[PDB]
Structure formats: C-alpha cells, structure tokens
Design a protein around this nucleic acid. Structure first.
Lengths: 584, 253, 52, 53, 304
DNA sequence: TTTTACAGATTTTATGTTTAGATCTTTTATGCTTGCTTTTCAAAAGGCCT
DNA sequence: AGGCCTTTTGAAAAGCAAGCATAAAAGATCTAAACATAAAATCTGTAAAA
C-alpha cells in the first residue's frame, strides 16, 4: 500500500494482554525438546551471573585506562619550564583515537582552558580562531561565579586586564591526521604571535593516529623548528605494553575458573582476529568473548551442570548426550585395552544408568589449573623477572598447546627458570561438552563473515538456500517449476559469471532466453482463475519473448542496485560492465 | 561459449576477462530489437511471477528461518545490533520480525508496547533531521543548553552525544526498536547519517535492526563506525521478488 | 585507510563510497611505502624495476 | 614505520601498486596458476619506459 | 495562495471560522493535528475552503523537496467519517502538468480528473454577456466582426480575458472620432508589434549607413557567437577598407536599430577566457524575409 | 466582579553567519578505433626409437 | 611396422601508437538551509479599580 512510500513511519504494535507463561527469556527447549523449564530459568540466571561478573571487571579496566591516561598526560603537561620562555609546550599523543577527556589542574591566579578542535570545526583559519576565542571567553566568564568582545587574539592581549588572571590555554586537536595541515600550520603561525604578551602559556596537544613521519612531512619546516622547542611524545595505544589485554583476558578466566575451558582453535582465532585490527582491540576482545559465551549457554544444555547444586537433575537424555563424547570413548577403550573386568564395562556401556549418573559428578571436583597457574607465570614475568612485553593470550595459547618452553625461550632471559615456569597439564574426561570452541565456524559466520563471498555463493549455487520438495506440487501454482527452472536473478548470475567484462545486454538477454523452458511456460502461463489479462498475451504468437523480457529486465534492474552491474554510456544504457567477480 | 576465458572467477578470473576485444569481434546490438512491451504487461506479469514461481519454497524458507527469532532477540538484548544481508528483499522479514515477534517479547519481559520506528532507507527522501525529530518525541530528551551547544555546531550530533552520556546512569531496557530498511540506500549511505545511526547504537536502550542491499556495504564503516554499531551479521538471503523498492528506482525503457 | 587519508579519492563533497563512478588513489609517497614493504618484508623494489 | 595491521599494510601496498601500474600489465606479473582451458597470459611491456611513473 | 511563497503558512489563514484561541501552535506540525481539527464540535455544520491559485505555491524547492512533497502530502483522503472537509484544487496554466511521478498518480484522494476549459464558440458567450443587459442596445455588434474577433484570438491557447480587452478597445477607438472600425486595432496591434520585416526595415533605415551595418551583424554571427561591438566594428574595417568614422557613430547608430526593436545590446557574462562584462549583439527575426528585403538595394546584395 | 492596565513573555520580522550541496565551464584524462608488429604457443614437419 | 620428442614453426593473439570523442576532475560562482541575534508589536496573566 501507500505506507511504504513515506520515510520513517513509526508504528505502535498492539499486543495481546497476556498469555500467562514463562516465555520471558529467549532460551529454547534444548535436547530436541526434552529439557525442564526450571533448568532453562536456572541457565538464564547463571548466564546472567557470569556475564555480570565479567562485565563488572571489563568496565573497571576500561574506566581505569582513563584514570591512567589523565594521570599520564597531566604530568608532562605541567611541572617543567623552558629557558627560552617564548615557546609553546607540545605533546604528540601517538596512536590515540580522539576519545579522551583532559583534566587541567588548579594552579590558582591562572585560568586553564581546553580548546578541543576537530576537522569539522576547522574549515579554515578564521573559524578556528573564532571557535577558540569563543571557547576561551566562555570558559573564562563562566568560571568566575560584561561587554562583548571580538573573537580574535586581542582578547588574549587584554585577558590580563579584562579578568585579572594569567592565561594558560591548552589546545587539543582531535584528529590531527584528518585536519588540513595547511590550515594547522597557519593556525600555529597565527598562535605564535601570542608569545609577546607575558601572561599567556600556550600548550599544544596533538592526537595522532599515525606515525610522526607523516606529520612532519606535511607541515612546513619553520613550524617544525618552532615545534622542536619543547616537544614530548607519548605512545597512547592499548597494544603497546600489553597491560590491558592482560587484564581483559585475565578477567575472563576469573569467570570461567574451573567451570568452562577454552579450546586451542578458539584462542588462536582470538589471536588472529585481534592482530588484524589495531585501533580498537579492547572492544574486539570483549565482543568475541561475550559472543562465545552467548553461543554456549544458548547451545549447551550441560551449562546447567556448571553449578554444583544442579547435579541431581540428570535425566535420561543427558545420559544419552554425555555418553557419546569421544573422550569418554577413549576412556572406555582404555578400560577395555589395559585390563579386562567384564561386568563393570558391561554396566557402564549401555545398561547401568546409576553408575554413569554418579560417575560424572566426581568429574567436577577436579580443577587442573591452566588459568590458575597462568597467573603465576604472569606474576613471575612481571615482578620477579621484570619483563613487561609479554602477551597473556599468546602465552596462554602456547600453554594450552604445550609448546610453552619455546615461548619462554623466545626472550632468552629466563634460562635458569624454564623448570620454575614449566607446567605440563593433561585433559580431564568430559572436556568436550564444557569447552568454549569454534569448530562449526559460528564466530566467523556472524561476527566477521565473508560478506561478498556469501552473497555470490547464494547467487550462484542457490540450492543451499532454496529447498526441494516432493509433496507440495499440485495444491500450489508452480510445482514443476522449482525443479526444472532456476530462479530468475539466480539464473542470470550463472551467465553473468562466465561473461566478459563488457556485456552486451541484448546478448545477455538472448543467453537468458534460451536457458528457459519453452514448451512448459506456454502451458504454465494459463493457470490463473481470477484474472483474464494473463491468458490473452498467451494467445499472442510471441508470448515467450514478451514474458522473457519482463523477467530479464526485472533481474537486470534488480542486480543494478545490488552493485554487480554498472551501466556505462549514459543516455544509451545498453552495454553493461561487469564490476564484481566471485571469489574476491 | 561467448566468453573465451581460460580462468573463471578469482583474481586471475578478474585479470583474464578484462582483455581487449577488436572492433569486428564486438557485438554492437541495441536493445531496441528486444521485443518491446507496455508498462501494464510488465506490471501484470511481474506481480504474477512474484508470488507464483517459487512461493511455497520461499514460505518454507521463511518458516525455516522463523525459528531463529529467539537468537535475534537474545543478541539484541545483550547489546549487539543486527545486520541482515542477503539476496532479495529483507523488508517483510523485518516487518514480520520487529513488529510481530520482537516488541511483544520485549514488553512482557520487563514487567503499551515498545515503540517501533521503521525507517524506509530505500527512499531517497530520507533526511536525518526529521528522522531525529521522530526520535526526539518517542524518547523526548532534554534540550541543548547554551554551554553544551557550541559555535555553529551540529545540534543533532551534540544532542545524541548528550543522550549517550545521559543513558549511562539508567536501567537497561529497550525503549525503541529502530528498523532500518536498506541501510546502504541512496540517501542514508552518506556520512552524517551514518554518524547519527552509529552514535544511536551506542545507547543500550535502543535496538538497531538494520538491513543492507549493496555488495560493497561494509566499507561504509571504519574502526569507529563498526565499533559503535557492534553488528552481528546474519545471511537471511531468501530470494524475494523485491517489488516494494523497485517502484522508487527508474524502470525506464 | 580512507579515513586516515592514506588512500583517497575524487573528493566530491560528501561522496558516496558505493558508486561505480567513484575511483580511489593513494596519497602516501614512495619513501614510506619502502619502509612499509621493509616491515612486512615485501619485495617491492623489483616491482618498479622495469621502469628505471 | 606505521602502527597498522597486516592487511592494512598490504592494502596500502596493493593500492600503491595499482595506482602506478598500467592496468593492462598485471596478468604478466601476478597470474601464476595452472590453466585447464586454452588461454594466453599477458605478454608484458616490450620496452621499459624510463620516464619513471 | 498568495501570501505563502514557501510551504509555511498554508493553514493559519483558513482558521478564521470561530476565531479560536488555538491555531498558531498545535496545528502547524502534522496531519494528525489537523485530523484532530477535522471532527466538528459545533454540529456537523460545513466548512469547505477553496485555496485559489494553488499552482503558485507548489513552484518552490527546485526538485520536489517541500512543495511537490506538499502536493503529494495534502491530497490524502484516508479517513472518511461524517466530516465535510473536502478541498477542490485550483491549478493554473499548463506549465508543469505533464511532469508527474508515481506518488502523485497512484490512488490517493482527488487526482484523476482534469478538463481543458477552452471557450470555443465565444461568439455566443459575448451574446450572453450583452443579452444579460441593464442598458438597452440599438445597434448591436456585427456578428461577422464578432466571429472575426473569435477567430483571431483562439489560436494561441484560447484566452478569453485576452478577447475581453479587444472589443472594449474597439468601442474605445470608436469614441476617438469625436464591422468597419473594430478591425484596425488587431490589424493595428498585429502590425504594430510586427511593424514591417523588410518593407519598413530599409524604409526606417532610409540611410545606407543605417542599412549595411545590419549586414555587418549578420556577418558577425556565422564566425563568432560572442559578437562584441568591437567584433561588430572589426568587421566594419574589414568591409569598408577599399571624413573619418569613429566608434561613437557606430554605437549610436546601433541605438536606432535598438529603438526600432531588432537588436539587443546589454552586458552578458562574456565567457571567452576572462569573465567580466562587455557589450553584445543579437538579432531576433529569421533570415527569410530580410533576405528578400535586400532584393531592391544593389549595394546590400554583395554583402548578403 | 469585569474591565483596565504595567510587567513580562512569547511572536513577528528582518538581517547576519556558517555549513552543505547544486549548476556550469574549462582543462586534463581515459577509452574507442585502425593499421602495423612482436611475442608465445600448439599443430606439425620430421628424426629417434620398440 | 609403430609412438615419441625435440628443432622448427605459422599464426592468431597481445602490444603499440597517432586521431577524434567524451567522460570526468577541479574550481568558480551561487544559493538554500541551519543557525543566532534583536527590537518592536502583540499575547497574556495578576492585580487593576468599579
């Protein structure tokens, strides 16, 4: 109708008043629909306890990097002078994204203002000056507890006699790699004349997200020699000095200490996806670990057994599920192959439910500390050895594999400690229902998918998305069409893939016209009982082409706004250009 | 047959099919010799073939992916945004998911319903100032004061930043479900709209349920946009005939 | 990379990225590309060997 | 040199390559896989141009 | 729809019905705030307004943005209770009728009826205006002259207000003697606007120096389209180089060709290389009758 | 008890300031066509060999 | 009497390069919308005097 013709129509969905059930949580009935409702409620509450215990530590680390950074910047912003006294202090914040709040100290009988500047707040030099002096007059006349001045450096000249305090303005350029440096060095030149006023103290703070050889290549050399008077650098990045990856991954183990385990493939996938992204890694760490936890409690019924009170709700289907673990198969093969007691394996094979039901609850008192010993290796490398360039994720990966000694000899600094820093752990039976893992490609398919490859796969093959049927063909309208005829927009792509770079739309139409059935669609087209217009065009002696051009032009103008087809030669639109290739 | 390509589609399929073809080997055939139709014959056979070619397999597919809905509600209520890419129209999926399923389940669980702001982003008349006008009466936030507004700044982006720092001291319940159809459409792929919709997804109290159509879509979002969205991607390609949106675009002869 | 002004394009005002008429170009010089190809250890000196 | 990722460094290198190389001479420098169908690769440039692009 | 200009003040002027206290604030946002005012508190009553000259409002915002948007917005007839709030449209001349779009043309409200109202047989119309009389006639207008007037008006579009200022002028030129005289006006205003293409062209020029210069502008068109008066004067000393003459004589004799109504000299962009203003030359009539005008002058034949 | 009448608040009108996006023109850039030429390969001409 | 295999080998496919065209970049010039200020008429709310 006409409601999908206007943008942003808000819609209130009306609702039935109540259904009076427990359907207030999304956790479905697992074990092919055999689970109890109280176990689903306990699973939801247990997942929320785990998720809250994780994120209450993640938030303290994330709100502690700001209390570390404000402590860092505000120490080399102050407590130092230069003998020239006609220079501005300059701090290059390397690798920093513009997300930090800066605090300026008391320093009484002197104002301290912070003038944040942006590539949107700087289209030329005069808007920078008007915004800077506007922020100066605002943060000077509102921090005092009346005339109108002009917003230029004259306010900086007579700031001493307008207010009575000395000025100390601290500039702050947010995306220094995104401003014009031609506007920025003009602003620095325009600021340089403020030196002669004896009550100012300009400080510049550059938030650079690239290296320093790309800022002093684009600036002019006189501005660079002015900036070489009192400059300091400061590396602000959460990959330098692995302290905040060794506090998010450390805190993830404090929630899963004994209840859950991590796989080998999972930690190497974490390391592969944390290394292909540098700007934000404290967020791509947490949104992989939480989505690993969310795909666990939604899938694994045995999560209800990670609390040692729910041990008595072992139904028959839990005993069916746990029995077909291959580590238990390895254990039972062990009980066969070393010695032969008959009537114990005959019990625990398929008959006795009580022995297997009480046997599994012994397997939860075990700890086998991977994450209980890895903190000892972390404390040994940080305190006793004083090496602060190690990664807890990669050390944990090698400790999980077992080649930890190679990673400890990667430094060649702890040769007398390769026995003290050694730990060879084994597997405990029934790990493979209690492990966070990725062997199905779930964290790949729904966090970092091959987007274009999935679109092209669904366009080309299309049988992995559309079903085939064997009963619903006679009550339908097209029963014999789903088996002999590919879907248009999925059939045209088979000709689009094996075409050239320049595709003539008439040849692209003829190749589509002779891959359709002729003697089927001329029978099919007369099926409709209601309308009468669709049958008279079948009484026309050129029905097949006039039904073929409709489907072809529909598929072409459907590909075009998807991105696979560029119509070159405007005012012709006859020779299209293939512009997406499969497999790339 | 009409392509002499040694390789097919990889990087060497790109390098191989980009050759140079002579003037006599070319086929300069205008599409005038295609048998012309009327507008109403197209309009008739189109709506016939939409719901009468693969109708029961597509309904079977929608019932297959319709038991996926509790995972979508779980991912929304745990903080993520959703992104539904795929072949075909994702329109009726989000009209049958967000209106029917989602907001009744959200409204019951925190105990009228939860307001659903649909946003037809395939319409090129999609300004962000009237869309943010439509957001600021479904939430009604505070106004921009004199100290918090700046010298000729953007009031929409500053208001969303003020809402972001307001909603860190609040209970975490969904207050709106923002349903964007064709998020990479011709008037919403631009930068300030995406800055708006990326700063809205920072708020936990609004669930973004987006959909894309173009294939080079993920390069609209850098390390700041793709971090404030924190999308989870779901290929729900269901081969829909996509006839709500094609009335907007040119169907010129 | 487009945000960090390292690859760049024809700056029409608020250009759409998803058009088949917007083409891209690098605007970093050779002297940093040699250091980059030294960092990942990529032999790029023999890619422009057939020009000088 | 730069605090970038591996794929971003290779994207910078590949964008540096394709915006200084002529588009016709890349199937002589990168095409390496065995054919199954009768095809010919790019021959490459005959004379090295010493204008230094 | 006069004092609107922008799509901003559509709804306040129709609000003098009960002269309410509300009207400025609640109404001008939304269609549901005018759906709030469609139900009638004071009985069924009636209030149908006729917004006049409605094509004048929708001619803004330069693509569709807030005017054509408003025409696809204010033709919704969605809810139909017992409420008399219809609005017939008063569209102007056919300037942007044949430009449409599918939102304007697909089943919402008062669209699919439009009629050309051209008054053919306006002779009977004049007969109705004169027979509906308050001042008895003796000698009526001759219907041969009435049909000649109705013939010589309705060829362009068929304006009736144009024809109403013709018979009035005919009896106004009748009163200047103190169908035989209701014809020289049209034979007067057709000839006055036309003047003479070639018969009076040289007649008014009578001067040869006011004749061959028009040929200089004719030769200054099929070499250059930026015909500067300098270029009209560099062509002048590429033709007569075979009492001096300065540029002032040329540019003041061009005022005669300006005064008659052939030539246009004003400042234009002057594209060229630099973009500052200079004088131009342009001619209007087609070179068919002027090429027959030179068939009598033996010196304007080699210059063609 | 209304109707006035000062105070203050909100509207009206009018012009100033900054940002974002359109049209049109000039100058360089890219692709198309036509004749000639230089590579790689695949059919083959023919000697070696079972 | 037969398969093979390496020098030689057409030869049709890549490469090259002047000649007109036409898209496309870059910028000049313009304009509309968001954004801000402000004085005077106008609305209105609280006592206003009868």
């Amino acid at each position: 109708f006409a409601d999908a013709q206007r943008s942003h129509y808000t819609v209130y969905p009306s609702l039935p008043q109540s259904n009076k059930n427990d359907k207030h949580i999304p956790f479905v009935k697992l074990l092919s629909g055999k689970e109890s409702e109280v176990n689903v409620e306990k699973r939801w509450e247990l997942y929320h306890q785990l998720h809250s215990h994780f994120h209450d530590q993640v938030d303290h680390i994330i709100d502690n990097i700001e209390a570390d950074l404000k402590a860092e910047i505000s120490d080399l912003l102050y407590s130092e002078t230069t003998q020239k006294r006609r220079c501005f202090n300059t701090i290059f914040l390397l690798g920093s994204d513009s997300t930090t709040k800066i605090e300026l100290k008391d320093e009484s009988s002197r104002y301290n203002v912070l003038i944040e500047l942006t590539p949107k707040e700087s289209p030329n030099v005069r808007m920078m000056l008007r915004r800077s002096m506007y922020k100066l007059y605002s943060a000077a006349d509102a921090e005092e507890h009346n005339n109108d001045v002009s917003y230029d450096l004259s306010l900086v000249e007579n700031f001493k006699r307008l207010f009575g305090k000395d000025l100390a303005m601290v500039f702050n350029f947010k995306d220094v790699d995104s401003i014009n440096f031609n506007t920025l060095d003009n602003f620095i030149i325009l600021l340089k004349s403020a030196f002669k006023y004896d009550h100012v103290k300009i400080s510049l703070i550059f938030n650079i997200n690239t290296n320093l050889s790309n800022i002093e290549k684009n600036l002019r050399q006189s501005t660079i020699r002015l900036l070489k008077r009192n400059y300091h650098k400061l590396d602000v990045s959460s990959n330098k000095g692995f302290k905040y990856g060794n506090q998010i991954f450390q805190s993830f183990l404090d929630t899963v200490d004994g209840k859950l385990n991590l796989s080998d493939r999972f930690v190497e996938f974490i390391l592969s996806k944390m290394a292909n992204n540098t700007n934000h890694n404290l967020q791509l760490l947490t949104k992989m670990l939480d989505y690993s936890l969310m795909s666990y409690f939604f899938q694994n019924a045995f999560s209800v057994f990670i609390d040692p009170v729910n041990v008595d709700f072992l139904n028959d289907d839990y005993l069916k599920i746990l029995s077909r673990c291959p580590t238990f198969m390895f254990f039972v093969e062990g009980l066969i192959k070393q010695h032969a007691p008959a009537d114990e394996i005959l019990s625990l094979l398929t008959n006795k439910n009580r022995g297997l039901e009480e046997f599994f609850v012994e397997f939860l008192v075990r700890e086998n500390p991977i994450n209980g010993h890895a903190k000892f290796v972390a404390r040994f490398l940080e305190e006793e050895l004083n090496i602060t360039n190690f990664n807890l994720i990669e050390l944990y990966h090698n400790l999980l594999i077992g080649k930890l000694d190679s990673y400890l000899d990667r430094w060649s600094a702890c040769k007398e400690y390769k026995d003290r820093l050694h730990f060879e752990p084994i597997d405990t039976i029934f790990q493979e229902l209690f492990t966070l893992d990725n062997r199905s490609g779930l964290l790949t398919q729904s966090i970092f998918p091959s987007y274009k490859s999935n679109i092209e796969d669904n366009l080309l093959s299309w049988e992995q998305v559309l079903p085939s049927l064997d009963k619903e063909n006679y009550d339908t309208l097209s029963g014999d069409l789903d088996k002999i005829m590919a879907p248009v927009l999925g059939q045209l792509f088979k000709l689009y893939r094996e075409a050239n770079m320049t595709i003539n739309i008439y040849d692209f139409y003829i190749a589509f016209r002779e891959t359709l059935p002729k003697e089927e669609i001329l029978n099919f087209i007369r099926k409709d009982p209601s309308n009468t217009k669709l049958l008279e065009l079948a009484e026309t002696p050129d029905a097949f082409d006039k039904v073929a051009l409709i489907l072809f032009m529909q598929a072409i103008f459907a590909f075009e706004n998807m991105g696979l087809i560029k119509f070159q030669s405007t005012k012709s639109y006859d020779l299209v250009e293939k512009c997406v290739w499969r497999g790339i | 047959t009409k392509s002499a390509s040694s390789f097919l589609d990889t990087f060497e399929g790109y390098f191989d099919q980009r050759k140079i073809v002579r003037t006599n080997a070319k086929s300069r055939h205008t599409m005038s010799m295609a048998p012309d139709v009327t507008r109403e014959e197209f309009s008739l056979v189109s709506n016939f073939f939409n719901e009468n070619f693969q109708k029961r397999p597509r309904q079977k597919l929608f019932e297959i992916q319709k038991k996926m809905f509790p995972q979508y509600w779980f991912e929304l209520t745990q903080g993520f945004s959703l992104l539904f890419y795929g072949v075909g129209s994702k329109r009726n999926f989000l009209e049958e998911f967000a209106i029917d399923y989602l907001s009744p389940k959200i409204a019951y669980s925190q105990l009228n319903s939860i307001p659903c702001l649909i946003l037809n982003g395939y319409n090129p008349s999609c300004n962000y100032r009237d869309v943010f006008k439509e957001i600021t009466d479904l939430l009604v936030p505070a106004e921009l004061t004199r100290s918090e507004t700046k010298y000729w700044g953007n009031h929409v982006i500053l208001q969303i930043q003020k809402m972001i720092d307001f909603y860190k001291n609040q209970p975490l319940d969904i207050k709106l479900i923002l349903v964007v159809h064709n998020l990479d459409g011709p008037s919403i792929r631009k930068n300030t709209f995406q800055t708006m919709l990326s700063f809205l997804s920072v708020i936990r109290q609004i669930a973004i349920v987006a959909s894309t159509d173009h294939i080079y879509a993920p390069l609209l979002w850098d390390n700041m946009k793709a971090q404030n969205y924190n999308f989870v991607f779901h290929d729900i390609s269901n081969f829909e005939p996509s006839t709500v949106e094609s009335t907007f675009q040119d169907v010129m002869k | 990379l487009h945000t960090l002004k390292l690859i760049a394009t024809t700056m029409n005002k608020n250009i759409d990225y998803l058009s088949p008429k917007v083409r891209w170009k690098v605007n970093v010089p050779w002297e940093i590309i040699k250091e980059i190809s030294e960092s990942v250890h990529f032999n790029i000196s023999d890619y422009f060997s057939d020009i000088h | 040199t730069y605090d970038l990722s591996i794929i971003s460094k290779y994207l910078l290198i590949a964008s540096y390559i394709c915006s200084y190389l002529e588009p016709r001479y890349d199937a002589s420098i990168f095409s390496r896989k065995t054919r199954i169908i009768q095809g010919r690769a790019a021959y490459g440039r005959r004379k090295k141009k010493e204008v230094n692009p | 729809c006069i004092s609107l200009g922008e799509p901003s003040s559509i709804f306040q002027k129709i609000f003098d019905s009960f002269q309410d206290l509300n009207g400025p604030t609640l109404q001008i946002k939304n269609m549901q705030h005018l759906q709030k005012f469609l139900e009638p508190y004071h009985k069924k009553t009636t209030f149908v307004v006729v917004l006049d000259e409605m094509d004048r409002l929708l001619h803004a915002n330069t693509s569709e943005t807030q005017s054509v948007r408003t025409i696809l917005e204010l033709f919704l007839l969605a809810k139909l209770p017992t409420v008399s709030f219809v609005l017939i449209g008063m569209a102007n001349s056919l300037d942007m009728k044949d430009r449409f779009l599918s939102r304007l043309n697909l089943d919402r409200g008062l669209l699919p009826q439009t009629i050309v109202f051209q008054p053919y047989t306006a002779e009977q119309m004049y007969e109705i205006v004169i027979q509906k009389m308050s001042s008895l006639p003796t000698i009526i207008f001759q219907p041969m002259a009435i049909k000649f007037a109705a013939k010589k008006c309705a060829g362009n579009t068929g304006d009736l207000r144009k024809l109403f200022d013709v018979l009035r002028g005919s009896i106004e030129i009748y009163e200047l003697e103190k169908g035989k005289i209701g014809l020289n006006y049209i034979a007067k205003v057709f000839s006055k606007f036309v003047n003479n293409n070639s018969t009076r062209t040289r007649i008014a020029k009578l001067n040869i120096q006011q004749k061959l210069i028009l040929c200089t502008i004719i030769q200054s068109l099929k070499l250059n389209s930026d015909a500067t008066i300098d270029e009209s004067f560099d062509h002048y000393i590429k033709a007569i180089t075979k009492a001096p003459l300065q540029r002032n004589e040329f540019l003041e004799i061009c005022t005669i060709l300006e005064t008659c109504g052939l030539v246009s000299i004003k400042k234009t962009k002057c594209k060229g290389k630099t973009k500052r203003f200079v004088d131009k030359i342009d001619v209007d009539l087609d070179m068919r009758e002027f090429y027959d005008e030179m068939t009598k002058i033996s010196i304007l034949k080699p210059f063609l």
